[PDB]
Structure 1
Amino acid sequence: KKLMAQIFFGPTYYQRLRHMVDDKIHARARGPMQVLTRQPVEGRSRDGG
């Protein structure tokens, strides 16, 4: 079906920023804990919480 309202269309320049979900997704379930406080460590790369 033809769209009721016409659509603005055309080429445009875009850039993919370094921020990606693959490196921005974290999840913890009883991981390592800091010896000083016996609490979860900081940082997803170090399996933090």
Structure 2
Amino acid sequence: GHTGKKLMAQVFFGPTYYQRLRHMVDDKIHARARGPVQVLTRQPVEGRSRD
């Protein structure tokens, strides 16, 4: 695509049935600088949803 030159090797090419799995990066990316702590231990809470 960059140069239009033929590729020296031939490429296995055709349609294939692919699936969209439920694991998205935007449902997993999490960062925490400072946030809520636990009442008992005063340590960072557990959970992406809980920060």
Do both proteins adopt the same fold according to a TM-score greater than 0.5, normalized to the shorter chain? yes
Aligned residue pairs total 47
**C-alpha root-mean-square deviation of aligned residues, in Å?**
0.5
- Alpha-carbon distance between aligned partners in 2 of 1:2 and 1:36, rounded to the nearest angstrom: 67
1:8-38 deviations in Å (ceiling 9; x for gaps): 0000000000000000110001111101100
Structure with larger Rg: 2
**Alignment partner, residue 24 of structure 1:** 28
Percent of aligned pairs with the same amino acid: 96
Structure 1: tracts of 5 or more residues without a match: none
Please, what TM-score do these two structures have when normalized by structure 2? 0.88
